[PDB]
Structures are given as structure tokens and as C-alpha cells.
Amino acid sequence: GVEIETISPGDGRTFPKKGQTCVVHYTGMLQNGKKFDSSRDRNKPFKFRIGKQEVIKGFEEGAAQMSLGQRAKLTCTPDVAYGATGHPGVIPPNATLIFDVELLNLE
Secondary structure, three states: OOOOOOOOOOOOOOOOOOOOOEEEEEEEEEEEEEEEEEHHOOOOOOEEOOOOOOOHHHHHHHHOOOOOOEEEEEEEHHHHOOOOOOOOOOOOOOOEEEEEEEOOOOO
């Protein structure tokens, strides 16, 4: 289940497709919890492409449901990211993830 809560401004037309490499200022958040990751702190804004299963599933579907300059708000189910296993030391099992995602990409 992908639930998009858009902070408005952008263009609404530059949709992410296959064969495109995209640049995202992500910020992870635990529901009823603190932060766990920040691209803003490293200031290396996470260049990646579409269609290689590099990112998790819940983040992958929310990427194409945005456009250039937009700012959504993700809400990922446990089964699409880590909830059966839990990422060791960082994500407990059966967890619900929150992301602040802005798409400032190229191509």
C-alpha cells in the first residue's frame, strides 16, 4: 500500500520512466520513532535508476508516482520493506516506515 501525500509544487508531468536515472533527497522516519537515515546529512543525494530492484519495493512505487520538484510523503507497509525480517540493528521486525521524498533529478 502506497499512500502519497504531496506537498504541491513541481510540474506534475515529468514522470519517472524506465531508462532514467533519478536524484532524491530522502529522509527516513520511524512511525512512533525517531530518524534513522538522512541524505541531507551526507549531502550526497543518492543517484539511482529505475528497474533494478536496488531500492525497496515501497520506495520504488512511490518514485514514479511523483514528478520533478514535487515533495510527497511515503507510508510503507511492513511487507514491502523489512517487516518479515527487520534490517539488523537498524529496523526492527514488523515496522512501518515514513519517508520525506523530493525528486530533484535529471534525464
